[PDB]
Design a protein around this ligand. Structure first.
Ligand SMILES: N[C@@H](CO)C(=O)NS(=O)(=O)OC[C@H]1O[C@@H](n2ccc(=O)[nH]c2=O)[C@H](O)[C@@H]1O
Ligand SMILES: N[C@@H](CO)C(=O)NS(=O)(=O)OC[C@H]1O[C@@H](n2ccc(=O)[nH]c2=O)[C@H](O)[C@@H]1O
Ligand code: NA
Ligand code: NA
Ligand code: NA
Ligand code: NA
Ligand code: NA
Ligand code: NA
Lengths: 456, 456
């Protein structure tokens, strides 16, 4: 599954999607292409269901005739009118019951052949529909700025700290002068481009950030979550876009798997096929993992890095996920304030939002030596978009419930707490002195009380 | 290069290798096969050097003749005695100068062809020699127990704590009752077999162990080392046996790379092509990485796990590596004594040692509910075996040093400090109560002062 079809089949729902597509500067016609694919698919299902019923009628009629010792019949030849009728889904059981045993057996095989053919048609139509659904964005929140370009379109909502201060050395220069980061040929000749070795104080800092970040979420009611770093192709497909396979994900062999780009992928996949009847309290996870990105100076943008993630699974009702989004961006803000890092928070414009996000806040920290705001955090409300793909249902789940006009799904949200390597770059720029890098106060107990890491 | 040929060319050295092969239940005839392949290889090189000098004689003679405006000559035909002479490495420079310009040009091409043919023979002999060298074990330490079967052949060196202690639930049962470990279909259907999810308190313990282990080694003079988790095929080949590519290493694609099975792999590979004139102080690295093993209940043996590694690069002189091996197993012992885990230390028998190890100590912790000693640590002295493969030289170069006749290489050792998931399994068995798992005292400051993680 990619998206639930229910909204597309409703006139009001289809218009809500079309409007969201226009507001995202995306194609509204994708909604119409999905409805048409679904109409063709529903036709194969109608015929399959009708023909499965007629196969059971054939079997029961043969059984009745064999019991009554009725002669098997003159021929197995099916009347062309009968063939035309089951191909059009109009063949009545009363007409099937007029056939002899020989014809009922032939018809049962003919109907089974039709079902096999229709299943192949339905598979091709599901593939077409699913490909179209991948280009459908989540329904935008009403507060999303309407713009195509990030540069002009994003809205700065909040700022913190001294965002105009300048510093001498950038993170690359500082990490070089510490003697604690090696990105030379000694590393790239063994591990490929953009690979690195961290040593000494920088490793102590990395661990101090992992542990401080995890404790920071534990204190706020998140459950630590350590995932597998591998996902199979099928499962990865449910939590990643097609474009992520070609540009971002490494393939692992030795049954093909993919390395995770963030703990958001295995945490969302962990809820696949789940059904929470009620979520009086939301599910809050503190994901901890290495992240691997194909990405198709220094350690600002690398293939391998640690990240502490906020992940929330909540009720889809009473706009609760919107309250969680505000709490999650606030947590990322509080975290950066605790490190004494200046920043701004931006509300991402409609044209720049990834398909799963109904709204996204980025926290961009100030890099005083680089002289720029740089993204450290992304916090998104994915509402029920990922839940439809992984099939994570919500609501009453009782015996006797029929094909419900409205299937409810959980809401899911994800947000960076700390992308470790990039935070270390930001810390190095903001805490540099002539002697080295001052360790932010809150991190000192997490790294043996060390107050500064010195230039070599 | 697999091994340096120098020890095989020495009669005493070759006898030392043959004896070590017999004492390891390996083939001593491999030594004689290598000597023979090297004898044929030296013949190709003698002939290559002779013909290279002869090519220069051709170039100089053609040069001198054209400067003296001498005519080309009557023929390009090479006298049969000239061809026989260069094919046997007996062609004299005086016999070459007697040839005309046309013959000298023909001879230079013929000698170039012979050099190309000799290079193909030399490469095939290098491949044979290297394939044989792969079945040559490191020279055994004289204290290694002589036996084939690890089950009965290892020698118990030391024991600590109550190694007969019994406990109620095993690590799998404990981790399940905690509600903090998931190895069910919810994980295996998304990440493959032997994959897992850790939650809550067990993640806090996982981080507490990583941080305590790193500080433990920092306090003992080790430099933290965070590596790339990928290595290219060429480089991985220098730090892994061919059996490891088949049975242990995952392949990564997106040049083809391999996931590291241990930080020992990238740390050793980091010293490739290096040369240390002296190591008055050794190089000590505290490796920190996730480890990935194909392995072709619970989290005792899984594909993905964290490990803190001890890695030492030292002088090959005065058996200094042997003092380091003692310090390294003592460091692992002191670590498990600080955690209060009972164990035994074993000296691994000759037949069970991997080819790189001259000697190996395993620390096998006592699992009181499982009722067994289980390997938590391996400490190996690889002497110069890995340094020959990665070309990590030591001391003076041969040329211009009358007293230097041997190519010296650094000594390398590696030893587990803490294999995090297996240590958590051990702590769970040893620290269980009716209410949960008591946190070892040393780890409490590393996990928010938590005294116990409670059953669900
Ligand atoms: N699961 C969600 C929320 O964390 C997610 O992954 N969003 S993200 O923006 O793709 O990634 C989350 C964060 O990861 C960091 N990052 C990215 C690439 C890189 O090379 N190094 C980094 O440090 C960036 O700071 C970014 O804001
Ligand atoms: N570099 C050296 C020394 O650390 C090395 O890797 N040796 S080892 O024995 O292969 O591995 C080192 C240690 O890794 C652990 N391990 C292994 C496999 C697994 O599935 N889970 C584990 O926890 C075992 O306890 C073992 O003693
Ligand atoms: Na810069
Ligand atoms: Na982002
Ligand atoms: Na005892
Ligand atoms: Na057991
Ligand atoms: Na071992
Ligand atoms: Na010499």
């Amino acid at each position: 599954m990619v998206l639930d079809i229910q909204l597309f089949r409703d006139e009001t729902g289809a218009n809500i999607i079309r409007e969201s597509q226009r507001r995202r500067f995306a194609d509204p016609d994708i909604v119409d292409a999905i409805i048409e694919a679904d109409k063709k698919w529903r036709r194969t299902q109608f015929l399959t269901e009708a023909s499965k019923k007629l196969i059971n009628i054939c079997s029961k009629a043969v059984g009745a005739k064999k019991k009554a010792k009725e002669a098997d019949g003159d021929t197995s030849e099916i009347p062309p009118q009968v063939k035309e009728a089951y191909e059009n889904g109009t063949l009545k059981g009363e007409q099937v019951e007029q056939l002899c045993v020989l014809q009922l057996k032939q018809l049962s095989k003919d109907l089974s052949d039709q079902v096999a053919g229709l299943a192949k048609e339905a598979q091709q139509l599901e593939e077409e529909r699913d490909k179209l659904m991948l280009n459908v964005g989540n329904i935008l929140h009403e507060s999303v700025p309407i713009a195509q370009d990030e540069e002009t379109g994003n809205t700065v909502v909040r700022t913190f700290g001294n965002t105009t201060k300048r510093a001498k050395l950038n993170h690359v220069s500082i990490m070089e002068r510490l003697g604690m980061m090696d990105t030379s040929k000694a590393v790239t000749s063994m591990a490929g481009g953009r690979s690195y070795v961290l040593k000494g104080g920088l490793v102590q800092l990395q661990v101090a950030l992992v542990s401080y970040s995890l404790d920071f979420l534990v204190k706020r009611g998140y459950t630590p979550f350590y995932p597998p770093f591998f996902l199979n192709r099928d499962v990865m497909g449910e939590v990643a876009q097609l474009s992520q396979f070609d540009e971002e994900l490494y393939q692992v062999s030795g049954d093909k798997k993919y390395l995770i780009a963030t703990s958001e992928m295995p945490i969302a996949a962990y809820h696949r096929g789940r059904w929470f009847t009620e979520l009086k309290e939301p599910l809050k996870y503190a994901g901890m993992s290495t992240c691997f990105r194909k990405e198709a100076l220094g350690i600002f943008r690398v293939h391998q890095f640690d990240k502490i993630e906020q992940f929330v699974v909540c009720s889809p009702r009473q706009e609760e996920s919107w309250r969680h989004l505000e709490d999650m961006i606030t947590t990322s803000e509080e975290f950066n304030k605790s490190l004494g890092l200046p920043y701004r928070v931006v509300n991402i414009c409609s044209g720049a939002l990834n398909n799963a996000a109904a709204k996204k806040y980025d926290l961009e920290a100030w890099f005083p030596a680089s002289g720029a705001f740089r993204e450290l955090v992304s916090c998104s409300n994915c509402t029920d978009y990922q839940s439809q793909s992984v099939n994570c249902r919500y609501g009453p789940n009782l015996r006797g419930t029929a094909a419900q006009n409205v299937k409810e799904y959980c809401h899911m949200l994800n947000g960076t707490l700390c992308a470790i390597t990039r935070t270390m770059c930001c810390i190095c720029e903001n805490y540099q002195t002539e002697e080295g890098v001052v360790i932010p106060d809150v991190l000192r107990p997490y790294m043996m009380g060390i107050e500064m890491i010195r230039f070599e």
